Amino acid sequence: SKSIVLEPIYWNSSNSKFLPGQGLVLYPQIGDKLDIICPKVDSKTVGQYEYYKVYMVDKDQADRCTIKKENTPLLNCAKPDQDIKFTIKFQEFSPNLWGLEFQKNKDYYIISTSNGSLEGLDNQEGGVCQTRAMKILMKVGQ
């Protein structure tokens, strides 16, 4: 039962992967933890009308640069939520919800629309996954 700290998100800080051409790789491995922290533009008035919406979707949606309407668990930093903070810890068993547990022989993809294009300003669309590459990949086999 280890507990280090990967995916260190401190508003907009440098990462281990540092957008290598895909975005940000995650480690779906028991022993690790990841903490997302974003302040957003609000009281500090520095981001100047900028907010983002990370959402879990297949590679097929990463290919279109669009989110599925069957989304709901938005991340990154939304307007109707202010500062987002969440820490997940890869614990052995979770009696609270099986969503904090993770399974083997599985692969997860997630994309975001950090370009905030006029077609995708409020709709499920982007241009960042196409160029910046803001997606995630989680590899857990054996």
UniProtKB/Swiss-Prot annotation:
Cysteines paired by S-S bonds: C38-C77, C65-C129
Glycosylation sites: N12, N115
Extracellular compartment residues: 4-142
Localization annotation: Cell membrane; Cell junction, Adherens junction
Domain Ephrin RBD: 4-140
Post-translational modification summary for this protein: Inducible phosphorylation of tyrosine residues in the cytoplasmic domain.
Tissue and organ distribution: Lung and kidney.
Protein role: Cell surface transmembrane ligand for Eph receptors, a family of receptor tyrosine kinases which are crucial for migration, repulsion and adhesion during neuronal, vascular and epithelial development. Binds promiscuously Eph receptors residing on adjacent cells, leading to contact-dependent bidirectional signaling into neighboring cells. The signaling pathway downstream of the receptor is referred to as forward signaling while the signaling pathway downstream of the ephrin ligand is referred to as reverse signaling. Binds to receptor tyrosine kinase including EPHA4, EPHA3 and EPHB4. (Microbial infection) Acts as a receptor for Hendra virus and Nipah virus.
Assembly, per entry: Interacts with PDZRN3. Binds to the receptor tyrosine kinases EPHA4, EPHB4 and EPHA3. (Microbial infection) Interacts with Hendra virus and Nipah virus G protein.
UniProt family annotation: Belongs to the ephrin family.
Protein name from the UniProt record: Ephrin-B2
Residues of the full protein shown: 25 to 166 of 333
